[model samples]
Structures are given as C-alpha cells and as structure tokens.
Target: MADLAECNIKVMCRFRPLNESEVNRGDKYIAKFQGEDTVVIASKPYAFDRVFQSSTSQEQVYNDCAKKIVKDVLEGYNGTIFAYGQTSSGKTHTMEGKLHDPEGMGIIPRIVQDIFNYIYSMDENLEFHIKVSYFEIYLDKIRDLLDVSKTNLSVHEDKNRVPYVKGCTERFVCSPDEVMDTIDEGKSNRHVAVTNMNEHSSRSHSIFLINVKQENTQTEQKLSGKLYLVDLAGSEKVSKTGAEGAVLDEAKNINKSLSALGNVISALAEGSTYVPYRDSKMTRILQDSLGGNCRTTIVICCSPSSYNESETKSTLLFGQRAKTIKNTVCVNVELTAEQWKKKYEKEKE
Candidate 1:
C-alpha cells in the first residue's frame, strides 16, 4: 500500500462564482505555496447560465486542477473528486452544468469529454471498458438514483463498529455519449426539492462513480480504476435557511450528519485513538473517499458576501482541515499471463 501523498497527488483550488467579476482574481484572491495555506475569493449572485458561461472558456477554471484530475482518471488509479459548499455557492453549477445548455459544460462533463478524447488518441488496439453508477445519500440513507427499487441502503460497520464503505453498483457503458446519456437519466431520478436556501435545492448528497477497466494491446495486460464525482449537500443553518415541516427535519438531519463529518475530520487531524465513523451514516459511506486508500481531491465552494461571513468562515475551516489529511493510495498493474495462471493454480490448490 502506498500513501496518496507518495503518489504525487496535487492539490489545486478554483474560485468559481456565478458572476465573472466574483471569480477569484488569480493573483489577488488565489493563494498557493508549498506546505502552506490556500485561500481564494468566492462567487456572487447570478443566473445559472451566467455562472456556467464564465467557467467554460477560462483556462484557469479548468487548468487550475482539471488537468491533474484528468490524468489520474486516465491512469489505472482510483480517483475521487468532490465539490463541497453552502447552498447557492455554485457547487452544482461547478459539477453539473445548467440543463439544456451546450456551452455550459461543468467539470463532470468536461472530464467525460477529456477521458474519451484521451482514449481515442490512444493506439486503436487499446480497448477500454467503462462502467458508471449513480447514488445519493439523503438524510444519511443511501438511495440508488438509477435503481427502480428506490430502497434505502445501509452502511456496513467494521469489526470496531466503524462504518464500512463499499464500492458502487456498476452500469456498463460503451461510449462517452452513452455515459452522458446515463448521467441525464440519473438526473431525472435525483431528489430535488424547493427550499428557502435554494429553489432547486438538492435534497441529497449525490455521487457518480465511473469504473474504468482497460487492456493494453501490446502488453496484453489489464488495469482497473475508478473515478468518483461527488456533489455534497450544501451545509446550511436552519435559522438562516428557514426550514419548516419536512424540510426543517431534513435540514436538521443534514446538519447533524455534516457535524459528524466535522468530528471525523478533527479526529483524523489530531490522530485520535478513536475516530467516530459511526456517528453518522454519511461519514461511514465516505470512509474510503475521506481517509481511505484512494486518491482524493476536495473543491470547497463559498460565497464572498458579507452576509454569509459565518458560512464563509466554516467553509475556509473545512478547506484548512482537508489540507491536513494524508491518504494512502496504491496502483495495481494487471498481472502477466504466467502470473495469472500461477495465481489461479494457487487458488485451485
């Protein structure tokens, strides 16, 4: 097993806002240094269309961290990239572009495009098999957005009673176009509801995992990798978001789960003897992505408005803690024919 830090993982920050001017002014708002802190400006209010438009053409928007993200996915390494922020902070806009808009391609779509583009550029003999899965964590319950059952999934706890994180159900896809269409289908099944925080507030924490299985023609070796695109539910204050009835209940649950996540972060940062993974189902399901054996990147979104100072502070704190997390990731190359046969014989014996 190798540490993610040892894998040459890179951390980059992008300040995407709904307005062009609100985008982090590279020199002024953005900060980056070795073994130091990173701070960037936040977004301002605007229509969804404007937000997506501002990010499409700017190389900084995609260049900041997008290239490394693309590279990790193409290689035989499991990668998890997630966007986190408060309501109306443009996380959804950053991950999934506005519907019915061509120019407004978010990070997910751009990643999909880049993946296929890289695959196509490869030697024709290289064959790549892709599978996709979509699910949402709602009030700490795992709901398969693509499944017709719509049944809730439970977290399996480890021997220490820690929640055990598992891989997602796989959906076979042939082309990049098929992947896009599958995403569209999943979106139709997403649980979006109206709320004071966001008219189109996402009622669940959504994740899309892409599993890549590839074979090299010359080497005749196979490799498997995973890419996880997660859009977490905006952390909202009940008093500010003005929840009521079922919405209020949902808000409370969301906050509770997020609070548990914070506890896990604090414990990990402190190197505690007991990390509270069982405090919430969300933390348990995210065990691998949060601190397990996988390459991970977290994009923290925020609002620059003075009115949202508290939320901004919290977001910054989250980013600060994330900088402390060190994950161990390992790369496994496919075995040669002789190695496979020997392993098969050993298993048979």
Candidate 2:
C-alpha cells in the first residue's frame, strides 16, 4: 500500500522589488502584503495559499513552497512546479535564478541539491536511478534542448495514457554537479530575444523534467516518480511591446499558445471533462502533470512597481483560476517481485 492524497494545486504569489529604472522613473509599490497569505493589489485583496513580499529571501520561498513537493516526488509521487508572469516580472528569477550564488540560486538549482542530498541519505540497499530531459515549445513546435539536431519532436502516450515526447533525449546523472551541467547544456539552446520591456525576454516555454526510480533490494519493490519544472514565456500584452516584422510574428504565436493554455486552465477550473490538452504542445506534454494524478504548485511572480499594475493583476487573476484545479493523486509503486511473477503469468493467458 502507498500514500494517496487529494492534491489541490497550491497557488502562491510573489512580489519582486522595483528595479533601478522603475525607481528612477518614480514608480511606487502597488502590491501590499497584508499577511502571510494575502496581497492587496490596487485596492483589491487577492488570497493564495502563500504570499511572499519583495524582501523575502529565496531560501524562504523554496522552503515554504518547493521543499514539500520535492519530498513527495522522492516518495514516488509525480510533482510539478511552474512560474507564470508577464515579461520582466521575475518569473525567470523565481524559476532559474543565478546559479553560482548560494543565497540567490532559484528553485531549480535548490531542487537539484535537495534531490542529491536525499539520495545520499538513503542506505546502500536502495538503488537510485536519475535521468533528466530538457525541451522547449517555441512557435508551436517542440525542440529538444539537449540535442537541438532532433528538432520537431512529437508527443505520444504510453499504454497508461501518460504523454511523453517521442524522441527526447534523457541523460542519466549521478551527482548534483552533473545535473546542473546537464541543465546548462540545454539552457544554451533556449529561444530568447530582446524587447522593450525586458532586455532578454524568453520567447518560448521551457520544461526541465527529472525522472527518479528506486529499487529496494530487500523488499524487491520498485518505485518511480516524475518531476517537472517549467518556465513560461512572457505573458505581457502585445501593445506594450510595440512589435513589428519577425518580432510581431513571434509575439502572435506566443499569445496564441498562451491563450490555448488559458483555455485549458479555464476548462480545468470549471471541472470540464473535455479539457483541451491538444490545443498546445506545452499543454499536451504537461497533460499528466497538470490535471492527472500529480501534485502541482504554481508560483505567480509579480513586480511591485505601480507602472506595471495591470500586468501584475492579470497574473494574479490567472493564478486565481488555476487555484481551483484539484487532482486525485496516488503513488507510483510497483508490486513486489513475488506478486509480479503471478501478475505476469495471469496476464499471459
């Protein structure tokens, strides 16, 4: 028997301090943290499971939001964590902060550290296997970040109905350093460009997936878990960017995919049976982690500058809809060796 729990997607909001340019332009703070779980934006009170002010440390955020998810993943439950916000609103800062600085490192690097630490804590009787795969959805196409040569990969579902990329490369990693190195290799292939709002705007959504499997020699039991860390593209309005030419085309595609994601979110929030996972490649790839048997956490990043008040509010609203999705989760554990032989014998008939 394994753990079974109701996983209502935990929604959290974070406000980053105004940048030097915003301060120079006399921008004032528009979001006020009333308490631990409430934020007041533009005279409206929005509530979440957790809320972090501008001065909150990265460690605090990880400990409060992500640590539990990682623990559950190690225990054989699928887990998902993602960031959503407008351009320059610190989504990247929340998901993939500076890697070198211990204090400033974001959730991804911290997750890597924690996972390896967990592996180290276990006894020799437990065998651990970890594999990582990275990819991005750019302009409605899937590109394997690890091997850019294998572009335009398609999605397929296994017999269990769990979706996956057909030819995505999965690299085995033993240590935390190797995991970070793998991430660095894939990160270099991401699609990014300059925009007026942000100097280096991500034009596509990137997903970093980690698969963990454990075999206990004593009990002859096998357990597997899937973890996803996604960093979405800029969700800012097109009018703010003042785009034209190729940039405009990119913006349109980004908007279309995000809208498809929005539609999926709306359907999930309403508890619709016909959820549109086929609308976008990102949604399709995330089908198992989104509404299936998985524990998902979404962090909506926002800027505290009054100049960007509308975008921040829109981001918060998106989180509000996402908060309604709940998943019935169960652990991914296999039968013991004694039972597996019987199961296979019975199935062979």
Candidate 3:
C-alpha cells in the first residue's frame, strides 16, 4: 500500500500579544480560548485544528503547526504552510521571525532545521538534493526575490498541470545554513514600507519554495516533493490605513489578491466545478497548494487587541472557510528502471 490520505487544509489560529501602542491605548484582549482548539471572540466562536494564545511560545506553535508537514515532505509528499492576517497582526512574526535569536526562530527556520536533520539521519544510500525558490507578489505582479532584476515574472503550467513561476531562480542548498542564507537574501529584496497601522508593513505576499528529490541507488527508487512557506501581505481596509498615493495603490493591489483568494476559497468551499485560479497571481501560483495534491496548512494570525476587532473577525472567518477545503494527498515515488528513465527523457523532449 502507498502513502495516501484525503485531508482538509489544516488551520491554526494564533493571537499575538498586544503591542506597546495598543497597551498605551488601553486595548483589551479580545480572544478567549476554550480548550486548545476553539477561540471565543466577542461572543462568536471559531474552531480550528489548533489555537495558540498570546502566551504561547514560538517553539510550541511550530511543533503544533508545521513539524509533521516537514516530516511528510522528507518522505516525498508535497506540503504547504502559510500565514494570513491583518496588518501588524504578527503574520510575519509567525512565519519568519528573528533569524539570529534561538527563541525568536519561527516556522520557516524550524522547518529548515528539521529537514536537514532528518536527511542527515537517513541511510547513506539514499541521496538527496534540495532546491529553493523565492518570489513575492506586489501590485498583482510577481517578482523573483532571489533576482530582483527579474521584476515581472509569470506563472505557467507544466505538462502534469502543476503551476510554477517562470524565470524564478532556484538555489540548490546543501545545509540548513545555506537555506537560511537563501531566505535572508530574499528577505532583503522583499517589498516593505511604512503604513499607518504598521511600522514595517510587508507590502507584498512572499513564498519560499522548496523542492526535494531523493534517489536510492540500492533500490533504484526516486521520489520528488515540494514545500511552500507563504507569508501573505496583511489584509487591511483602506479606511484603516488612511493613506494616499502609492501606499493607497499598494493597498488596492493587496485587496485584489485577497479577494481573489476569498473567491477561490468560497468556490472550493462550495465544491464548485470551476475555480477562478486566474483571478490573481497569488491564487494562480498557489493553485496546487489550495486544492491540488499538496498537504496545505494555514495559520490565521490575529491581533488580540480590541482595537483591531473587525480585522481579527475577518481573518477568523477566512480561516473558518479555509478549513473546509480538502486536498487529495499522494506521495511522489517511482522505480527508476532503464525503461522508466527513457520514458521520462522522451517525455521531456
């Protein structure tokens, strides 16, 4: 029997602690947790795969949210984990935290370490190769983070109907340090700016993509897997930003991608035969992660302050609907016989 399972997109809710400004304004904590999975906000209840309160540590969040997916990726199952939330609600914090500090490390670094550690522990006969690509969506345009000069990339589908970014630079990495350096390089190229709601608001949605291939010479078996770590631009109403000019335009583009995402989520939630994957670049590039063969996990980041109650509710609603979408999971494995090699070589021609 092969490794296969039908699974819903895993959703986890995280409420970040109130910041200094929020504390100065006397903002109250708005979320109350029931057990470890349900959150009560303003008399409304939202349940997820798991819920992390403000007091939860980063280690705990990574363990509960992403560790299993990393394990599956090592075994040749495609996996995706992304964070969604409003401006300054800690989406970035949850996805890519302080790179230098041990306690501040987030899901991205932790997943990298786990992947390398597992690969090191595996049998020597099993050869492994890892390549990673990074890109960001700004104003509905995709830019390769590794190569900032490639500003306007496009999405294309492979012969197998899998969507990928064209002209995206992929770096082959040998260790966790190399992976982290790759991420740092991309982070340096990411679009960031100041907004009324946040000091360093990420003005784009970024995806760190990882591809893993394994070849076992002893058994002549080969396997391929992919993992995506997405950090979405903050969901914010224009009124909240109170901005004009370029920042305002940026907000509009962000809304376009988010609404497109919402529409896709709705269509999938309804079991619609057709999904509007072409509505925006983010949804188009993430088509496989949303409804295809990938094991998707989503973190709904929330601000615990009462000041951002509206945005928090919307984020929760998004996660609530996302939980209903299921992905058909299957492992990528093949026996690398001479005939099989010839078929693939011919297919590529």
Candidate 4:
C-alpha cells in the first residue's frame, strides 16, 4: 500500500441506511464511523480520509467534499467524481439525486448550477462556453444515453491519448435547468430495471461529461476543463441475483465489466502500471480521468445492514488497498480542510 494521503485519488466511504425489508428481517448493522477517517465494519477497522454516517445530508457531502472538484473544473483542471460499491448501495442516489428536490439534488445538478454561477461571477469580458454529454457503458458497449437512436458508439483516443466517445451527442446547456432537462432526457433512455435487491436500478455505468471552455476577452487567455460525474454499476454476484437466460446474461455482463474496473484498482495495489484497459469500455471511458491528470474522487457506497456485511467488508478492503494506489504523479495538489485544492494556481492576472 502507498501513502493514500499524498495521492491524487481521494477515497471516501459512505454507508446508506437500511430500508424496511432489511429492518423487518432483523439484519445486523455492521458499519460504524469512528471519526472522520476511521470506519469499523464487522469488528475490522478501515481508514479513509473521509467517512460519512448514515444520516449525512446529501448537501453536506457535496458542499464539504465534492464542491472543490467542481471548482477545479472552473479553473481549467479536469475533475472526476465516481460512486462505487455493491448493487442498490445508493450510487445512483449519490450521483443523481432527485432533480425535483431543490435541496437534495445530486452532485451532477449541483455542479451544473455551481459551474455557471462561477463562470458568471468571473470577469464580464470573459466568454465562457458549456457543453454536456451523457453516455453509458452497457455490456462492454458504449451507448449515447442522450441519443438512444445512436448505439454501439466507438471510443476513440485523441492525439493526446485521451479517450472520447466518437459522434456522441454533446448539447449546449446555458442554465442549470437546461442541464436538468438533459439529465431527464438521458434518464428516460438509460437502461433501468428491477432486481431482487433493488426495486428500480441502473444497469450500466453512467457518465455525465461537462466541458467548459472560456476565453478572457481582455487578456487573450483561454481555459478549458472537463468534469466527469460517473455513477458506476455495483459489483454483483450472479448467484445472489437469481436471474436466468438473457437477463442473467446481461446482468453478468454488468458485473463482469464492473469487476474488470475493480481489478484495475487492485492492480494498482500490486504496483503494476499495466492494465489491459483497452479491453474494458468502462476503463476506456475513464481514460481521461484516471489515466490523465484529472482530480479524482471515488466514493464507495455501502448498505449498513447486517446482511450486507460480507459485501461491505469486501468493498472496504478494496478501498483500503485502493487508497494506497497513487493514480497520478503529476499536477495533483495536496488538499487541506479548506475546500480548494489548486493543481495550478489561478491564471496570473
């Protein structure tokens, strides 16, 4: 394991409270937060730089931990926020909270509002542009969620070795409401289904990419930033899902691809730079973030129920190992209790 505190990848663990069924069955509650950095599950302690309790407010999580990532985007540094864990573990809730709720919207919507707010707050002479893209990696294939008609999209690398979805729909969103509309359109098209564990769930890795490019009319300076908010499909055991035929097959593919990404993080623990990342579409989609100098935050969401002890335990151990893997050696700033982490100081005015 490497020094997690000094690394670019900041891993945070959040535990979701149990629902009615879990409570009716008398499932045990195994996850407990010892403090800001320590969490105990099944009598084993794991440490992360930040830990969130079951009652943590969605607003607090973003304002305290994720807001800085969005701020970095405004200043022209790439930023990524990815949610991970087992099925129905609140990844969706954390990344795409209900848009109708004013105070509880997830990081994506909140980020949209904040980005434009910051941009408008900048110099009046600054001309800023914002474009958004939504896509999903389903069963090893990338689909443009915004344009469901376009399927089987190809992932291509730019001259800079940054991967991009070729011909994917990217729309200009001026207001946060426009961004919310884009999200709504994508949600209607995103592959969703019900499982034994979740009444309604996402069956793919969802990526919401927001591209910001601006130029100062006065200074003749330009800034470009790409922010990715990813809601990754949780790892699931086929035996537990109890699906058959095409459904089970599709489900397996989800788990299969998710497991492959998990393997990538694990490989970091092994100190191997080589990950056959080309083989995994999810990994390819993450190329710009994990493989490049993007400020990254991985939030592992776990259920606090006793029944989830096994899966929760597995997730925490992985997080423990993952924290030690320094994803980027260049341009990642060491952050403090203050929200801002400057990869490069604001433009020398």
Candidate closest to the true structure, highest TM-score: 2
Candidate 3 on 232-256: residue-level lDDT in tens? 6655554545445445545677667
Full-model lDDT, candidate 2? 0.60
Q: Please give the distance, in angstroms, between residue 304's alpha carbon in candidate 2 and its true position after superposition.
A: 3.4
lDDT of 4 by residue, 80-181 (tens): 776765554654454454455567565666677666777778677777777877665554344554566647555456554555545646666777777776
TM-score of each: 0.65, 0.77, 0.77, 0.75
Assess each prediction's global lDDT (C-alpha) against the native: 0.52, 0.60, 0.60, 0.58
lDDT of 2 by residue, 57-99 (tens): 6667666665656755755357777776555565445546545
Report the lDDT of model 1 for residue 192.
51
Worst 10 residues of 4 by lDDT: 1-10
**CA shift of 91, model 4, Å:** 4.8
> What TM-score does model 4 achieve against the real structure?
0.75
Lowest-sum lDDT 10-residue window in model 3 = 1-10
TM-score of 1: 0.65
Q: What is the lDDT of candidate 4?
A: 0.58
- Count of backbone collisions in candidate 1: 3
Residue pairs with clashing backbones, model 3: none
